[PDB]
Design a protein around this nucleic acid. Structure first.
Lengths: 144, 114, 99, 56, 158, 139
RNA sequence: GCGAAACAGUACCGUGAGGGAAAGGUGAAAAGAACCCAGAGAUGGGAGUGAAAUAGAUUCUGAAACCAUAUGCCUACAACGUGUCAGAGCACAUUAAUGUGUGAUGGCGUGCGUUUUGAAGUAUGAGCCGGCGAGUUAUGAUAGCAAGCGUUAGUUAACCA
RNA sequence: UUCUCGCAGUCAGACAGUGGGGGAUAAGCUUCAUUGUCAAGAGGGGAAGAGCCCAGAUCAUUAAAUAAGGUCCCCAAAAUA
RNA sequence: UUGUGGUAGACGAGCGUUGUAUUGGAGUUGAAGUCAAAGCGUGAGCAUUGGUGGAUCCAAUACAAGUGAGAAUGCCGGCA
């Protein structure tokens, strides 16, 4: 008939990982962001439970796009009000909130799920390098 | 010769009404809506009998390729390692059943070159 | 410890002293049955099967899966074909294995 | 206006949830022993120690 | 039916300017009070017709089945005598035949007073004429007594 | 102990009866008569009769001390309403109903005695299940 | 069931011709709750009778729709024609069953009927439960099946016993 | 798919390709012959979809392999130059 | 071996309900009705058991149907 299968449930163990954007690009780090937050690279996956882990990205304010995308590609952010469009480009979010850049990038590429919106907070982004979450005794590894 | 025929009517409605229960709201309260929900759920289960394996095979391949990318090798060569050379009858789900037992799947994924 | 045994068209992970449910074999209760089809007990995989390797299992009962009521219908089409599927199966366990 | 769809039982319940009432104050009258409501008159009539109303 | 029920043709509502269901008569089969279009009527006949020869063949067959019942032996006019109506005597007769529930219908062609004198109290025992036989009545017996003088008529009737 | 006291259909809408007697569930008769004599509602003065009747029931028919008695259950059982009509405009007529309420009030002495009803229903359940059982051992 | 089980063509409707309803069953026999308590009151709780009052006049049985009460479970960042396949957790034990109750969450998920070129639709019908409710007959013809009789055949009608 | 018997249903079609007609070779337009589908047929791909490509589904299967189509994450699958 | 989409449409085998013809059985030692439950069936259904219930019902073979309701802006009565 059928082969019974079981999975780990309500015993998930998650860790803290360090990664830096010194010479990265948006897409090639955002793909790893989605991979880690989904936990699809580890065999501990369970769609009924959480699978990703904590992540810290530090100094997002030096990531660089290839080509003129920083000046010609635009993001519109419309509030519920009429004519609430905030127009941003690639070049301006470097001298402005780059945290929302990785934020909306990572949320756009995951399915609309109550866990995914709960997933997105497990990653922390600051343009600086100092944060009180540095006391987590975290496992450090590049390209994470 | 009059026959009311409301008794077997009561029985048939009752026997339609047991299975329609546990629903949110008055869905399982009246004859018509309860039967509509039962038929719709029967269709849903009929289609889900295919959908479940359609999604579980994808879950299989993703869970396997997790470990495969952990060891670097890909699923594309994995099938070549088994089916072409050293022909076996291994199936997808037993791979992850072996993954869930530590230090055993390593042996299988290492004899691929032997 | 483990074993990879295919009954019918379904391949199963089976350990020692484990009860499980497989497709119907029409086997009456009580006797001991040695199945031929088996692969990768713990090492030394044979290509199609494991040669001369037997899995000796005991059958204890035949059961049926819950009543499956299936109805086919198309909207506004005067077609409400109802049917009831019962799914037979054999509940049994293994006792021995030989190379 | 006129309703278009029937109101459900649970909408009736949620609208009725704020359509309830609270309790009331209560106090003790020293001379005329009675569990009277606070800052009101007592059974014998003395709101304070003053009772100009008839005791009947 | 729709025309048999007493009533008029007045319409409670007019044919428009109202979202009410359409009605056209005071009484309808789909309206309470009655008025079913088709029900019991005193015209249904259950008429059936079978040829005489086929019915006579069915007779001859059922007699021959009874004539081979082996529990319906011959009886003579004499033994109906010695009693007028004393069912006790006929009760002893019935007991001696070892019959309890046998719905014994007796064939008679002499109209001797003794038998129709009895056989009208208990539902079990009745006596009827040879000219009045019916196939169900013949097999309703399950035990019966035949008089020997009518054997001549039986062989004459084939 | 039940201390049940019935009323049988006094003319009040049960919606307002439940509305007034959420405020009494779980409380003690010591702090119930007073609050029932102060709240300015129509049903309030009307159910004080039932409350004191229940007090009399408890004190007389059984006769326990009753100092631990508390309000166990209020309910407004829906009886058969009355039907009337009134003329309206355009020759139309409005249809009006008169709702009454069957009221029975239960006073409990201990925070218990429902669990006993639970095992009573379980006793019904078991007598059922062994009744099913004897069908098989019957030879 | 005559519309009319019952004081029925009654009540009632229009002035008038005329139109036109609904509802029965207690229990063996009222033996119909003496008397006590609470409350003016009906009433309820006792007692007693009644086998039995949860048969107390609402008075054979009392489904469901409807309204409440509470065992346990789940729930206030949630985008859903509300369920299905899995599924932890929580509480347990049965028409002994790969047991049951609920479902944190994941995958999927645009009704019934009719109309039709085609309808999740903003085409229509349905607030809801329940009760009833619309393919039968006189004669005859055609076709199909089976039986009887039989290729100087076979069958009767009306009517009578 | 011939012939006879009996029951039919049905004459309101539309869509996609070609040949065309009309329009203005304009239409989710109108009308044909032909090639398929929907009506009367699920599903997968196409962002959903009445017809388009793969396609005709007894029931079950946390079985395998292919058709179209696809393998940066959602969303399952690849890389090499 | 062919199979097992399907309206219209056609074909075959069907189920339940009332009462009747029998052959039987059960019934205050609690019939049937009634609902609650984690049954048996390819189907209309068939059940098993308890309480409630307080008096006729049921198995099989045939017989004749006011014999089979989800919809009719349906009616009846109630609930909204």
């Amino acid at each position: 008939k059928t082969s019974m299968l079981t999975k780990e449930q309500a015993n998930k163990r998650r860790q803290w990982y360090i990664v830096d954007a010194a010479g990265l690009v948006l897409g090639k780090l955002a793909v790893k962001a989605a991979d880690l937050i989904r936990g699809k690279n580890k065999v501990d996956f369970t769609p009924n439970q959480d699978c990703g882990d904590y992540l810290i990205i530090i100094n997002s304010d030096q990531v660089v796009l290839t080509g003129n995308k920083k000046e010609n590609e635009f993001w519109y952010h419309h509030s519920q009000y009429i004519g609430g469009i905030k127009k941003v480009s690639g070049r301006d979010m470097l001298k402005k909130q780059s945290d929302k850049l990785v934020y909306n990038a990572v949320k756009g590429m995951l399915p609309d799920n109550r866990l995914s919106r709960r997933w997105i907070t497990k990653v922390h982004v600051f343009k600086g390098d100092k944060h009180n979450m540095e006391a987590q005794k975290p496992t450090t590894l590049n390209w994470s | 010769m009059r026959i009311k025929g409301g008794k077997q009517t009561r029985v048939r409605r009752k026997k339609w009404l047991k299975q329609a229960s546990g629903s949110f709201g008055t869905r399982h309260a009246s004859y018509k809506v309860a039967k509509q929900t039962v038929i719709q759920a029967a269709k849903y289960a009929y289609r889900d009998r295919r959908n479940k394996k359609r999604d579980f095979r994808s879950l299989w391949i993703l869970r396997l390729n997790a470990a495969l990318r952990e060891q670097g090798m890909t699923y594309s060569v994995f099938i070549n390692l088994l089916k072409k050379h050293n022909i076996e009858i291994n199936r997808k789900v037993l791979s992850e059943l072996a993954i869930k037992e530590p230090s055993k799947f390593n042996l299988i994924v290492q004899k691929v070159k032997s | 410890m483990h074993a990879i045994v295919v009954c019918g068209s379904k391949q199963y992970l089976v350990h020692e002293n484990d009860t499980f449910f497989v497709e119907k074999l029409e086997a009456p209760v009580g006797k001991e049955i040695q199945l031929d089809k088996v692969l990768m007990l713990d090492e030394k995989i044979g290509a199609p099967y494991l040669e001369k390797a037997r899995v000796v299992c005991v059958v204890e009962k035949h059961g049926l899966q819950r009543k499956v009521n299936v109805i086919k219908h198309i909207s506004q089409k005067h077609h409400l074909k109802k049917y009831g599927h019962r799914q037979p199966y054999t509940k049994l366990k293994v006792v021995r294995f030989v190379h | 206006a006129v309703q278009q769809r029937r109101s459900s039982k649970h909408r009736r319940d949620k609208r009725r949830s704020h359509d309830a009432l609270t309790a009331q104050a209560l106090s003790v009258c020293q001379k005329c022993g009675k569990k009277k409501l606070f800052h009101r008159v007592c059974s014998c009539g003395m709101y304070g120690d003053l009772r100009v109303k008839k005791a009947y | 039916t729709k025309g048999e029920v007493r009533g008029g043709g007045k319409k409670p509502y007019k044919q428009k300017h109202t979202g009410k269901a359409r009605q056209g008569s005071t009484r309808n089969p789909h309206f309470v009070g009655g008025g079913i279009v088709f029900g019991p009527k005193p015209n249904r006949n259950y008429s059936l017709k079978l040829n005489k020869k086929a019915h006579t063949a069915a007779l001859h067959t059922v007699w021959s089945e009874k004539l081979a019942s082996d529990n319906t032996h011959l009886v003579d006019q004499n033994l109906f005598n010695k009693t007028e109506g004393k069912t006790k005597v006929m009760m002893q007769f019935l007991k001696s035949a070892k019959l309890l529930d046998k719905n014994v219908l007796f064939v008679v062609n002499t109209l001797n007073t003794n038998l129709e004198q009895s056989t009208s109290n208990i539902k079990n025992v009745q006596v009827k004429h040879l000219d009045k036989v019916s196939v169900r009545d013949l097999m309703l017996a399950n035990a019966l007594l035949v008089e020997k003088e009518v054997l001549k008529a039986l062989e004459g009737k084939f | 102990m039940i201390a049940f006291a019935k009323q049988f259909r006094v003319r009040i809408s049960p919606q307002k009866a439940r509305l007034v007697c959420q405020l009494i569930v779980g409380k003690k008769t010591a702090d119930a008569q007073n609050i029932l004599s102060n709240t300015p509602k129509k049903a309030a003065t009307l159910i004080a009769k039932l409350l004191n009747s229940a007090i009399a029931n408890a004190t007389n028919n059984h006769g326990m001390n009753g100092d631990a008695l508390y309000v166990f259950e209020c309910v407004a059982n829906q009886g058969p309403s009355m039907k009337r009509t009134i003329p309206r405009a355009k020759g139309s007529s409005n249809m009006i109903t008169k709702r009454s309420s069957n009221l029975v009030v239960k006073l409990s002495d201990n925070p218990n005695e429902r669990q006993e009803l639970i095992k009573q229903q379980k006793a019904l359940v078991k007598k059922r299940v062994e009744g099913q059982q004897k069908a098989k051992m019957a030879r």
